[PDB]
C-alpha cells in the first residue's frame, strides 16, 4: 500500500539571505502519507453549572521519530562563514497530535 | 460517497449522577468520524542561528466539529433535586488542521 506514512527526500539550494553567500544543495527528509487509524470526536457530559471542554478528539498524524543535528558552513562572501542547522529525519511514524 | 469520509454518526448513551440518587436517562448523541483526503507532513525548518527550536513544519488535518449548540438535560433525583447535565450537540463537521 503506497499511501502509508513514509519518508521522502528533496533538495534545496542553500545561500545565506541576510548576507551575500554562495549556494549549496543538501538532501533533506520529510514525511507524508495516510495512517490506518481514523479520527473521532465525542462530546463530554458534566453535571456542574460552569461548562468545560465540550469534546474529546483523537487524531493520528505522520510525524518524525528520530533527528540529527547537523551543520553546514557556507560562503557568505564575508570575513567568515555563518553556518546553518536542521534535523535529518531518519525514521517517521504515526502519532497522536495531542499526545 | 466513500464510507470512510469525515461524516457524522448518532448513538445512544445512558446519563446517571454518580453520588445523588437520580433516575437514569437515555439520550441521543452525535459523533463525527472518518478520513480526509489531505495527508500530513513534517519538513525540517532551516534555521540560521546557534539555537534550534522545533525545526519541523507540521501540517496535519483532522475531522473535527464545525458548528455545535449547547443543550442542558434536567436530571431528576431522589426527593427534591434538579441536577443538570450539559453537553454540546454536534450540528456539522469538516476537516481542519490540528495545529491550525
Amino acid at each position: 500500500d503506497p499511501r502509508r506514512c513514509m519518508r521522502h527526500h528533496y533538495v534545496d539550494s542553500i545561500s545565506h539571505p541576510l548576507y551575500k553567500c554562495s549556494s549549496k544543495m543538501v538532501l533533506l527528509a520529510r514525511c507524508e502519507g495516510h495512517c490506518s487509524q481514523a479520527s473521532r470526536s465525542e462530546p463530554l457530559v458534566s453535571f456542574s453549572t460552569v461548562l468545560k471542554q465540550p469534546f474529546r478528539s483523537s487524531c493520528h498524524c505522520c510525524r518524525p521519530q528520530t533527528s540529527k543535528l547537523k551543520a553546514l558552513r557556507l560562503r557568505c562572501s564575508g570575513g567568515m562563514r555563518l553556518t546553518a542547522t536542521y534535523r535529518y529525519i531518519l525514521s517517521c511514524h504515526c502519532e497522536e497530535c495531542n499526545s | 460517497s466513500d464510507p470512510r469520509r469525515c461524516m457524522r454518526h448518532h448513538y445512544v448513551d445512558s446519563i446517571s449522577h454518580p453520588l445523588y440518587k437520580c433516575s437514569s436517562k437515555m439520550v441521543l448523541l452525535a459523533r463525527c468520524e472518518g478520513h480526509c483526503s489531505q495527508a500530513s507532513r513534517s519538513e525540517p525548518l532551516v534555521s540560521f542561528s546557534t539555537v534550534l527550536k522545533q525545526p519541523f513544519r507540521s501540517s496535519c488535518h483532522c475531522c473535527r466539529p464545525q458548528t455545535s449548540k449547547l443543550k442542558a438535560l434536567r436530571l431528576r433525583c431522589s426527593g427534591g433535586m434538579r441536577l443538570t447535565a450539559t453537553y454540546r450537540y454536534i450540528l456539522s463537521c469538516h476537516c481542519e488542521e490540528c495545529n491550525s
Binding site: - | 448518532h10 445512544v12 445512558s14 433516575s23 437514569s24 437515555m26 464545525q66
Partner: protein, 731 residues
C-alpha cells in the same frame, strides 16, 4: 431565506422558537435538517413535506400536534431521525410511518399514548433507537415488537406495566440497552428474557418486586444490573450464576433479611459490594473468585468473625466498613496495601494487638468508637504513617499510647472516664483538632488553633485557682480572721457553770457553725497555696476523688446550720417579750437537719463536680439541690424580718434585742448578692461575665463568717467585757 427562519448553515434550516402554525414556504429544496420545534403547529396536512425531498433529520418536539395525516410523511425516503416528544398523540401513528424504511431513531416519549396497534412498526427495517417512556402503557406490545430484529436501544420507563409475560422479547437478538424502571412490575415469568444474548444493561429500579427474579439466568453478556428501591428481602443461594460478566449491581433501599453464603462468589469483574440491613446474616460471605473489589460494606448484620485471608485473596481494596456487628476479634490486616479507610464502630472489640494494623502504608482514616476497647498495646501505630483522623470515643480506655501518631490532624478521645493521665503536648505538634476526656487536659496543649472541645473558662482555671492577686488576698484575710475570732467567742461563752439563758445560749452555736465555715475557707486557701501556677495535674485528682466531697459537705453544712440557728434566736426573743427546756431540744433538731441537708448532695450524681471550689451553687449549670437550697434560705429570712417587724413594732433586754437585730441585717445583704447572681437566665442580668461572678461568690459567700464574731468581740460592745471579765476572773 424566508421571513421567519435562519436558513443559515450547511443546508441546515432552523426555525425553532417562533409562533409558526404551519410549515414555512420559500426555503431551499436541498435542506438536509429542519428544526421547527417549540411552535404552535397542531396538525400536519396531507403532503406537507413535498418541498424537502432530501431532508434527513426532522424535529417536531414541543408542539401541540395531535393529528398526523396518513399521507403527510410522503417522499421522505432519506429520513433517519424523527423526534415527536412533548406532543399530544393519543396513539402511535402506524399508517403514517409505514413508508420510512430508512428511519433509525424514533422518539415517542412524553405523549399520552396508551394503546399500541398490532400493525405498528411494520416497514421499519433499519430502526435502531426507540423511545416509549413517560406514557400510559399498561402492557408490553409483544406482537408489534416482534418486527424489529435490528433494534439496539429500548426504553419503557415511567409507565404502568404490571407484569412481563413469557417470550416477550424472544425476537430481539441485537438489543443492548433496556430500561424498565419507575413501573409497577411485581411478577416476572421464568421464560421472559430468552433470546437476549447481546443485552448488557438492565434497569429494574422503583418497582414492586417481591421476590428475586430467577429469569436473569439467560443473559451471558450482562454487565450492569440495577434493582434497587424494590421489596426484595431474600437473595437465593446461587443467584448470579449465568451472569459472569457483571460489573455493577445496585440493591440498596430494600428490606433484605437473608443473603445466601455462596451467592456473590466467582464474580471476577465486580468492583464494589454494599450490603446494609441484613439482620439474619451471621456468617461472612464466600468470595472465592471475586478478587477485584475496591469497596466492601457489610453493616447491620450479626457477623461475629472475619476470615483471616481477606487481604491475601484480594489486593484491590480502598475502603472497608464493618460497623454495627458483633465482631470482637480483629484478624491481622497485613496484606491490604491499598487500603485507606477502616470503619469498625459499634462492635464488641476488647483488645488491640501488635500485629493488628501492621503493614498499612496508605491508611488515613480509622474509626474504633463505641467498641468497649480497654486494652491497647504500644504497637500497631508506627506502620501507618500518613494518618490524619483517629476516632476512639466512648470506650473504656485506661492508657492511650502516643507513639507513631505525630501526623494526626483530628483526634477524638471524648467519652472515656478511666483515662486520668496527662497527654504529652510535644507529641501532637501537627495536631489541629482535639477532644479530651477531661477539661484540664487542654491546658498542656492549648498554651500553658487546636480548639479543644472542653473549652475551659473561669470556673475551670489552668493556672490560678482563686484568680487575681486581689481575690486571693481577700480570701486569705477572711480565713485568718474568722477562725481565730470564732474560737475566742466559744471559749468565752462556754466557761461559767451558771445557768445559761437561751439568748446567751444561741450565740455559742452560731459560733460553732461559723467555726466550721472558717475551716472550709482554710481548706480552700491551703489547696491554692499547694498548687500555684500548676492547676493542671491537680485538677482531675481533686475533682474526681474524695477531697471535693468532704469540702463540699462542710460548706453546705456550715452555711445552712447558721441560718436555721438564727431563726430560733429571733423566735426566742419574740417568745420572751419554763420554755428553756424546749430550746435545747430545738437546737439539737436544727443541727440534725443541717447535717441531713449537707449529706444529701453527697450521694446523687453530677453535683460537687461543677467548679474546683466544690460549692453547691457555683451556678450549677444540678438544678435541684442548688435551686432548692437557695429558695429555702430566702423563705427563712423573710419570716425572721416579719417576726422582728412584728417585734419592731412590738437596759439589758434592749441590748439583747439590738444584738439579734444586727445579725438579721449584717447577714441579709450578702445572701442578696449571691442569690441575684443566681437568677441569671430569667433577667439576663445585663450578661454578667463568669470571672466577676466567681470573684463575687468567693468574696461574699464566707463573708458573714468573719463579720458575725467581730460585731460581738470589740465592735458594738454589749457584754464581751463581762465575758473577758468573768473569763479573766476565771484565768
Amino acid at each position: 431565506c424566508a421571513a421567519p427562519c435562519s436558513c443559515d448553515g450547511d443546508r441546515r434550516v432552523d426555525c425553532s422558537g417562533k409562533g409558526l402554525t404551519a410549515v414555512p414556504e420559500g426555503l431551499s429544496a436541498f435542506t438536509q435538517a429542519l428544526d421547527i420545534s417549540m411552535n404552535n403547529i397542531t396538525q400536519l396536512p396531507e403532503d406537507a413535506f413535498k418541498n424537502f425531498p432530501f431532508l434527513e433529520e426532522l424535529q417536531l418536539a414541543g408542539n401541540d400536534l395531535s393529528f398526523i395525516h396518513p399521507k403527510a410523511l410522503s417522499g421522505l425516503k432519506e429520513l433517519k431521525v424523527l423526534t415527536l416528544q412533548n406532543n399530544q398523540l393519543k396513539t402511535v401513528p402506524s399508517e403514517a410511518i409505514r413508508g420510512l424504511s430508512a428511519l433509525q431513531s424514533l422518539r415517542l416519549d412524553a405523549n399520552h399514548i396508551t394503546s399500541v396497534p398490532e400493525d405498528s412498526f411494520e416497514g421499519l427495517v433499519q430502526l435502531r433507537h426507540l423511545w416509549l417512556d413517560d406514557n400510559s402503557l399498561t402492557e408490553v406490545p409483544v406482537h408489534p415488537l416482534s418486527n424489529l430484529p435490528t433494534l439496539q436501544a429500548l426504553t419503557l420507563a415511567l409507565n404502568k406495566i404490571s407484569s412481563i409475560p413469557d417470550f416477550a422479547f424472544t425476537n430481539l437478538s441485537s438489543l443492548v440497552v433496556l430500561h424498565l424502571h419507575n413501573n409497577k412490575i411485581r411478577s416476572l415469568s421464568q421464560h421472559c428474557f430468552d433470546g437476549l444474548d447481546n443485552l448488557e444493561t438492565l434497569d429494574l429500579n422503583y418497582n414492586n418486586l417481591g421476590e428475586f427474579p430467577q429469569a436473569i439466568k439467560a443473559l451471558p453478556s450482562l454487565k450492569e444490573l440495577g434493582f434497587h428501591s424494590n421489596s426484595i428481602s431474600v437473595i437465593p443461594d446461587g443467584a448470579f450464576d449465568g451472569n459472569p460478566l457483571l460489573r455493577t449491581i445496585h440493591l440498596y433501599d430494600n428490606p433484605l433479611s437473608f443473603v445466601g453464603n455462596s451467592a456473590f462468589h466467582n464474580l471476577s469483574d465486580l468492583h464494589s459490594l454494599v450490603i446494609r440491613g441484613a439482620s439474619m446474616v451471621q456468617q461472612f460471605p464466600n468470595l472465592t473468585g471475586t478478587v477485584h473489589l475496591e469497596s466492601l460494606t457489610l453493616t447491620g448484620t450479626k457477623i461475629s468473625s472475619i476470615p483471616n485471608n481477606l487481604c491475601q485473596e484480594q489486593k484491590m481494596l480502598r475502603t472497608l466498613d464493618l460497623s454495627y456487628n458483633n465482631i470482637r476479634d480483629l484478624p491481622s490486616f497485613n496484606g491490604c496495601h491499598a487500603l485507606e479507610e477502616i470503619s469498625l464502630q459499634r462492635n464488641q472489640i476488647y483488645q488491640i494487638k501488635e500485629g493488628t494494623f501492621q503493614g498499612l502504608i496508605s491508611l488515613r482514616i480509622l474509626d474504633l468508637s463505641r467498641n468497649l476497647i480497654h486494652e491497647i498495646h504500644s504497637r500497631a501505630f508506627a506502620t501507618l504513617g500518613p494518618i490524619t483522623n483517629l476516632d476512639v470515643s466512648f470506650n473504656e480506655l485506661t492508657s492511650f499510647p502516643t507513639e507513631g501518631l505525630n501526623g494526626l490532624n483530628q483526634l477524638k478521645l471524648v467519652g472515656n472516664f478511666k483515662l486520668k493521665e496527662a497527654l504529652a503536648a510535644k507529641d501532637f505538634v501537627n495536631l489541629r483538632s482535639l477532644s479530651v476526656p477531661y477539661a484540664y487536659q487542654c491546658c498542656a496543649f492549648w498554651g500553658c488553633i487546636i480548639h479543644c472541645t472542653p473549652s475551659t473558662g473561669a470556673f475551670k482555671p489552668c493556672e490560678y485557682l482563686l484568680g487575681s492577686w486581689m481575690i486571693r488576698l481577700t480570701v486569705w484575710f477572711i480565713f485568718l480572721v474568722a477562725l481565730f475570732f470564732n474560737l475566742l467567742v466559744i471559749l468565752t461563752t462556754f466557761a461559767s457553770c451558771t445557768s445559761l439563758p437561751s439568748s446567751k445560749l444561741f450565740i455559742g452555736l452560731i459560733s460553732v457553725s461559723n467555726l466550721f465555715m472558717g475551716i472550709y475557707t482554710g481548706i480552700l486557701t491551703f489547696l491554692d497555696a499547694v498548687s500555684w501556677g500548676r492547676f493542671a495535674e491537680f485538677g482531675i485528682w481533686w475533682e474526681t476523688g474524695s477531697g471535693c466531697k468532704v469540702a463540699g459537705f462542710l460548706a453546705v453544712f456550715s452555711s445552712e446550720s447558721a441560718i436555721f440557728l438564727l431563726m430560733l434566736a429571733t423566735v426566742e426573743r419574740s417568745l420572751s417579750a419554763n420554755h428553756l427546756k424546749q430550746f435545747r431540744v430545738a437546737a439539737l433538731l436544727a443541727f440534725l437537719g443541717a447535717t441531713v441537708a449537707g449529706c444529701f448532695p453527697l450521694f446523687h450524681r453530677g453535683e460537687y463536680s461543677a467548679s474546683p471550689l466544690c460549692l453547691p451553687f457555683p451556678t450549677g449549670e444540678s438544678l435541684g439541690f442548688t435551686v432548692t437550697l437557695v429558695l429555702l434560705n430566702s423563705l427563712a429570712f423573710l419570716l425572721m424580718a416579719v417576726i422582728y417587724t412584728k417585734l419592731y413594732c412590738n437596759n439589758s433586754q434592749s441590748s439583747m434585742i439590738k444584738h439579734v437585730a444586727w445579725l438579721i441585717f449584717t447577714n441579709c445583704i450578702f445572701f442578696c448578692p449571691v442569690a441575684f447572681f443566681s437568677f441569671a437566665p430569667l433577667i439576663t442580668a445585663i450578661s454578667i461575665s463568669p470571672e466577676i461572678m466567681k470573684s463575687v461568690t468567693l468574696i461574699f459567700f464566707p463573708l458573714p463568717a468573719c463579720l458575725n464574731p467581730v460585731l460581738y468581740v470589740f465592735f458594738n460592745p454589749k457584754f464581751k467585757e463581762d465575758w473577758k471579765l468573768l473569763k479573766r476572773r476565771v484565768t
